[PDB]
CSV table of C-alpha atoms and ligand atoms in Angstrom, one decimal:
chain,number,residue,atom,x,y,z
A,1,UNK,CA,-6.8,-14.5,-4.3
A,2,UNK,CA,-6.0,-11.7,-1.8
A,3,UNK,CA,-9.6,-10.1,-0.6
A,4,UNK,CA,-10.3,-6.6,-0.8
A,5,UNK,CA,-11.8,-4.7,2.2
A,6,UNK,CA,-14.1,-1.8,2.4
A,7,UNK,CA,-13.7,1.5,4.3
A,8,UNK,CA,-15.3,0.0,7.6
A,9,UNK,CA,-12.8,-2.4,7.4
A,10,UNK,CA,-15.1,-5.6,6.4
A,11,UNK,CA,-13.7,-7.9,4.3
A,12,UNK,CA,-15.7,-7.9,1.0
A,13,UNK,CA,-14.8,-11.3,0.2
A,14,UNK,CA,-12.6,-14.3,1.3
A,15,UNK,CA,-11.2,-14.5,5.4
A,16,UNK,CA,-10.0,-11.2,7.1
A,17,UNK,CA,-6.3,-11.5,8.2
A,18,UNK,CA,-4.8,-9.0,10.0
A,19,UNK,CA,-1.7,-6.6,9.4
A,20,UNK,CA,2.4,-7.5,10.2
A,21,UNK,CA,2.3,-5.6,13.5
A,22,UNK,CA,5.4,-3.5,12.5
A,23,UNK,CA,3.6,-2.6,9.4
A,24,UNK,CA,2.7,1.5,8.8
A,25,UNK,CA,-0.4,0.4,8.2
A,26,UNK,CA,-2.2,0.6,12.3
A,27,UNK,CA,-5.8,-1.0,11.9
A,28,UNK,CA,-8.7,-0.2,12.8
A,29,UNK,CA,-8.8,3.1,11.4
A,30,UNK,CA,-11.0,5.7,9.2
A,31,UNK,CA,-10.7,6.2,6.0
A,32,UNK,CA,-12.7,7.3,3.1
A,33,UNK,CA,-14.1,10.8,3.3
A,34,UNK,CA,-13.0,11.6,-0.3
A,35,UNK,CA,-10.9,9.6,-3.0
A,36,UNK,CA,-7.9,12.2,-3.1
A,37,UNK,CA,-5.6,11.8,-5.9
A,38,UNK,CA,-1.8,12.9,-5.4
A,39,UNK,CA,1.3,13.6,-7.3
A,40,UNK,CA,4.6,11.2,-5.6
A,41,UNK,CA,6.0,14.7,-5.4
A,42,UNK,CA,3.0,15.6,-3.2
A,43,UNK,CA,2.9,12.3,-0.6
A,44,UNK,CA,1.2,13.6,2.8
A,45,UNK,CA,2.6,14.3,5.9
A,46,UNK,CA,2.3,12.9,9.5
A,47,UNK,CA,0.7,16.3,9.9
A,48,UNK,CA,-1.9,15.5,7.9
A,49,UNK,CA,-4.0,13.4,9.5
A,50,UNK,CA,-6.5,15.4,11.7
A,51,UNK,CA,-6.1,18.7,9.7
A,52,UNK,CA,-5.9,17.3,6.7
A,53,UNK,CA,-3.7,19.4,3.7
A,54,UNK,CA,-4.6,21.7,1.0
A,55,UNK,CA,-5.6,18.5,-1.7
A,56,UNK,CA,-8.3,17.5,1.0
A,57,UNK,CA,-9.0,15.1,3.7
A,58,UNK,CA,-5.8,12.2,4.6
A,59,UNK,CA,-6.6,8.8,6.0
A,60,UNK,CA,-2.8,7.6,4.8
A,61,UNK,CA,-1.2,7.0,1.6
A,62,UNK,CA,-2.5,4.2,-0.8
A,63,UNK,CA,-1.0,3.0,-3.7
A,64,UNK,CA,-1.5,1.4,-7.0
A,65,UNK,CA,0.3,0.5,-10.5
A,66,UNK,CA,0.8,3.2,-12.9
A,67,UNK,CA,2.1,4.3,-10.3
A,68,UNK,CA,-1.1,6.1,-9.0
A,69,UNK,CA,-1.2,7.5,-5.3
A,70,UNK,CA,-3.9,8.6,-3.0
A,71,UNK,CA,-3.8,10.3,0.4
A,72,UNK,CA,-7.3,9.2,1.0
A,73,UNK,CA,-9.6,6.6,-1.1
A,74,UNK,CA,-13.4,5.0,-0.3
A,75,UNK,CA,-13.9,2.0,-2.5
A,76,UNK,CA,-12.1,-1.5,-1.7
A,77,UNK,CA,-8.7,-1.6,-0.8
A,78,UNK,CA,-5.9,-4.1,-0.4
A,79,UNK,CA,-4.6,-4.3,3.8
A,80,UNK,CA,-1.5,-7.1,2.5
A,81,UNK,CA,0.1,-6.9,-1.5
A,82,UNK,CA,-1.7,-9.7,-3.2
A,83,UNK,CA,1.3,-11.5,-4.0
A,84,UNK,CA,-0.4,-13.6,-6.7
A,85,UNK,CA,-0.1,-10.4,-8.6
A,86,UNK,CA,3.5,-9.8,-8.4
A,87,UNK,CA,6.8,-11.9,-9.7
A,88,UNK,CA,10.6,-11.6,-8.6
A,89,UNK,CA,12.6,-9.1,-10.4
A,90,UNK,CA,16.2,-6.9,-9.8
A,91,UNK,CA,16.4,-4.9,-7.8
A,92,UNK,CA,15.9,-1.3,-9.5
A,93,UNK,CA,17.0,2.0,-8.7
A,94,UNK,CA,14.0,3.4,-6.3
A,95,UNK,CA,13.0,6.7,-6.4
A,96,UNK,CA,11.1,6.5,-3.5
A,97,UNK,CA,10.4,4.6,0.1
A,98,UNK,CA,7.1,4.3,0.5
A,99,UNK,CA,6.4,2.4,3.7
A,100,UNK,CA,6.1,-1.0,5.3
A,101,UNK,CA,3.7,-3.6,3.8
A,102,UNK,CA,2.2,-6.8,5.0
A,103,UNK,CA,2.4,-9.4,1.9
A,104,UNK,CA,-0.2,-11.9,1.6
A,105,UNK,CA,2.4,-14.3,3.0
A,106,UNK,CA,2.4,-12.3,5.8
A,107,UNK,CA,5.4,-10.8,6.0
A,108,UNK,CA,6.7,-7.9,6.0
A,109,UNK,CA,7.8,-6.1,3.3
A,110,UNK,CA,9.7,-2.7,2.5
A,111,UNK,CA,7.6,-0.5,-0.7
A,112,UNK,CA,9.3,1.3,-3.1
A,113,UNK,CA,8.8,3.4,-6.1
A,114,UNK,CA,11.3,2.8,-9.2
A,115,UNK,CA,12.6,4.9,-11.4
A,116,UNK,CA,10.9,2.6,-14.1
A,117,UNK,CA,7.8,3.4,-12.6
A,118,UNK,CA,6.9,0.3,-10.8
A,119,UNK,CA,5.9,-0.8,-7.3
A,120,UNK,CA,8.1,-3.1,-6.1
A,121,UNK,CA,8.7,-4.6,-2.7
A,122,UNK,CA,11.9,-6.6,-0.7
A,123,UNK,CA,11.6,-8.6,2.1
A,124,UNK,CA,12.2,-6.6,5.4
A,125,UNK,CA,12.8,-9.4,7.9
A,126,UNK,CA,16.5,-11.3,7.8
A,127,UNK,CA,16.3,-14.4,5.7
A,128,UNK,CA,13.9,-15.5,3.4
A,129,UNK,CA,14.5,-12.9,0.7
A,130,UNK,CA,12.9,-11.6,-2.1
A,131,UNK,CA,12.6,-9.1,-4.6
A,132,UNK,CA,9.2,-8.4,-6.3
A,133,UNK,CA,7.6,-5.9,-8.6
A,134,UNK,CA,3.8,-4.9,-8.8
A,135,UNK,CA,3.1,-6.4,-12.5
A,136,UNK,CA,-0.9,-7.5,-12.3
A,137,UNK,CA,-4.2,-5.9,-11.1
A,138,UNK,CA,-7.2,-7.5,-11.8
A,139,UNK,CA,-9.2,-5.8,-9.2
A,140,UNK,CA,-7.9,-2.7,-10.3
A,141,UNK,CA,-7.4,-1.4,-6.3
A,142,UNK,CA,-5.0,0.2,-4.2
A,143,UNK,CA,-2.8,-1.2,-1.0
A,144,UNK,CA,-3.3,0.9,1.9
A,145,UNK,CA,0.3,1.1,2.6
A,146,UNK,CA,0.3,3.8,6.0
A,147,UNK,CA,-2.3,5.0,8.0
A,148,UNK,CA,-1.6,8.3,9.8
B,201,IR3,IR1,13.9,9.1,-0.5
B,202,IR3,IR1,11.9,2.2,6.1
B,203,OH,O1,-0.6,13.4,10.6
């Protein structure tokens, strides 16, 4: 299975890999000062960052089923989508673009939000395509999907 790493960036369990450089996730990188819960309708900015916004501190966005989204988060965390945990669908209609994800395959992949509610993600490089929603989580943790 996928590993989960901790706000230092240690893996917690399993082999560190490393993020698809064209990812929006940009490691190394703080996070953790509070777990800040946000509304879709209330995503941070890149303006955030430093400052912060009126919900509290930003280290990024994280996300997880539900859908549930964070702006900043301390326990473990997902750097790649644990593929293991999601199956091909349709595409749907998406609501949102979230950002740029490493899978656990390695490659990159474009996030979105449906209308359904799930996470779902399409391959961003030519070739090779798939389509796959967010359907499992057993460790019950978010994917750092940006870092600001
Ligand atoms: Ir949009
Ligand atoms: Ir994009
Ligand atoms: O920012």
């Amino acid at each position: 299975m996928e590993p989960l790493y901790d706000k230092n960036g240690a893996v917690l369990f399993g082999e560190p890999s490393d993020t698809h450089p064209q990812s929006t996730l940009k490691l190394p990188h703080p996070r953790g000062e509070k777990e800040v819960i946000v509304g879709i309708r209330d995503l941070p900015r890149k303006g955030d960052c430093r400052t912060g916004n009126r919900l509290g501190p930003v280290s990024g966005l994280f996300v997880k089923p539900g859908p549930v989204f964070y702006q900043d988060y301390s326990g473990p965390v997902y750097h790649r989508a644990p593929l293991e945990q999601f199956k091909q669908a349709p595409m749907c209609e998406v609501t949102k673009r979230i950002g740029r994800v490493t899978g656990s395959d390695g490659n990159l992949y474009h996030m979105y939000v449906c209308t359904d509610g799930c996470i779902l993600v399409k391959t961003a490089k030519r070739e090779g395509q798939d389509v796959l929603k967010w359907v499992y989580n057993v460790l019950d943790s978010p994917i750092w999907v940006t870092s600001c």
